[PDB]
Symmetry: D2
Subunit: 215 residues, 4 copies
């Protein structure tokens, strides 16, 4: 697959929509405000459209390395704020994945250059849950660190002024923390779903509980 290839395939794909689905065109222009925001990893091993079944333009998308929501990341925050305040998305989904190359680089910690700074946000979390991970077998640790990372970005997100003020306003917005692996492509809801500031706290704690309970 080189460039002339994708250009060629595009043209033909576009022609053949006429016989497969012309309305694919017309579903998009009518309406189409998306109802969901998806925050994912740039690894994007499986595309959210395919995972979920959603048509495109029911979705609004942010993808950074390891699907982080840093407190002061104006890029990601700008996506969220537009999504919540302007497109009035009903749900937001942070999806991680087992085998995440950036979760991995945080842990193994090679000298990769500029990215290592971004990954320090992951090592912070790994530290934060040291004890928890200590009490479980090493085989299960990396993947648990994926689940913890999602869960923490869910926590971060509900703490943003954007979400705080939206919930207090009476806007109906729910946050989710999912993960999947490429062994099956099967979603695992991490149980951190947050419909307000109270449930954000409860369910943050609940889910950390269930990792510290099961292990």
């Amino acid at each position: 697959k080189d460039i002339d290839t994708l250009i060629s395939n595009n043209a033909l794909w576009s022609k053949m929509l006429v016989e497969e689905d012309p309305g694919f065109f017309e579903k998009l222009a009518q309406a189409q405000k998306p109802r969901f925001l998806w925050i994912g990893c740039s690894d994007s091993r499986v595309p959210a459209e395919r995972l979920t079944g959603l048509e495109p333009g029911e979705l609004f998308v942010h993808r950074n390395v390891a699907n982080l929501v840093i407190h002061t990341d104006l890029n990601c925050l700008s996506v969220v704020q537009y999504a919540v305040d302007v497109l009035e998305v009903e749900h937001i989904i942070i999806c991680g994945h087992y085998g995440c190359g950036g979760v991995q680089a945080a842990v193994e910690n090679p000298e990769l250059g500029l990215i290592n700074n971004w990954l320090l946000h992951i090592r912070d979390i790994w530290f934060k849950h040291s004890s928890l991970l200590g009490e479980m077998p090493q085989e299960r640790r990396l993947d648990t660190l994926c689940e913890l990372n999602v869960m923490e970005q869910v926590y971060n997100l509900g703490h943003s002024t954007i979400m705080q003020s939206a919930w207090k306003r009476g806007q109906k917005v729910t946050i989710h923390g999912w993960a999947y692996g490429i062994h099956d492509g099967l979603l695992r809801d991490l149980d951190v779903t947050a419909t307000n500031r109270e449930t954000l706290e409860q369910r943050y704690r609940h889910g950390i509980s269930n990792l510290k309970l099961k292990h």
Copy 2:
């Protein structure tokens, strides 16, 4: 489409892969370093996998509002640096789209809150090409502003220390500026493709030329 729905569809989608394509699983785990980085808009009216035909994990993805590459955006830059220096992607693609909601909000300029700051980076460009746009008909202006925005983010990207140092190192990396609309889903190469620092300049100018030539 509510949440229980996507969870349900996911499970069934995942089961049915066994009969449609079990290898979908095994193509991913072997290898799979992606060869392409895609920078797009969070609007994501058409997913890059579908536009292009690429399998997932031939792609690495960044999506922000109006597919900007701001000089000092550590989020987007962190994606690029990992992509170029660590995954050694061969190509990078910045894809815009006609009807881009954020290109639109820059122009019409409503009070949307936090996002307006991000969109100031677009109004800067619109100003920069005032004369050029002045010499063409108003019907063609918004869409031309999409093309200009892509083209400028291509210019920005080749100016990043990351790209500058990669090209000087002898790494083989090419930048593209595409756009598409949902009228047909058909890609338009904007002709700004840059294989080094010399071609970045030539083709930046070349493409601005062809807008100022055709109009």
Copy 3:
């Protein structure tokens, strides 16, 4: 001057305040909300307290390389927002300086590494005012580029959602663009002072006018 030196001098400085000015202590604790925000360059060849005469804690301070106010710089913006919305500063001052090492590095353009990305925000401005600079003698260009940079950060600042919403709210806040050199330490008001959205535009244009008028 090594470390033991500053620690030693500090102790003695602190003791000797008793005889020079004990109230220096008590002016600070009462009140002291500052009335001015100062955005400067990290070069800080002359400290704002000394330039201006202000007591400390009449001032609130941000210093980055070449005193930029980037649209999406959450650090600088966070300073401004707290200053304007919480401390209710009455004035904000962006001060540049002739001989600014970072204005210089933008122009001469050496490979310095990470910083070069930040300085691209300066080369953008230098481009924006190419014609203007072209019509004047080269001897006067670098220093004029300092004045232009200040002036543009003043323009940027009044365009921030923070300032836009503050002015529309009825809050009384004025923006200034100053510069000085170390030949005399003498301030030059660049005439871009902005008490609202209307005066921001007028005086942006006014001052660019006077550079394009005088030259």
Copy 4:
């Protein structure tokens, strides 16, 4: 103190340098690369020149709200990188202060708007040292949280790719964590001084030890 006032005082201050210190001018132009970087709080209750005794232009300065060094803060990082790689500063100093308005707002947690996001980086630390603070009296907690914040930004800073790569290169750079209050203006070295990656770890731990030892 209004604007005409500072302009007037400036002019007169500048004239009167001739009789107080004309060389103040000529010390600056010769050389003057600074040997120290100072990272402080925008509160800037006491200016570093006065605290320390340093002449201006022995210093290079960054001031944000509560003197944070966030992993992904390109503004602050850009200052550090230029300072360390280009000006070859020998020392870097992070100075906090007791009574810090932003440390305070993190704790009390009022709805101040945009700034609250920046302050989440402080509440993270406060959490991180919950136990430690729990074992001491409440009267001593806020001020201890200042010391912890400095100490953590010192830790963050030595973890930046910039510092990591500089130390490994053989560059001679030392990090300090100081604090002061306006009761006396007296510096307290927090004992986190780091001359390399090994001493960064030792002394991070050492200093946390001495808070957990003394209390």
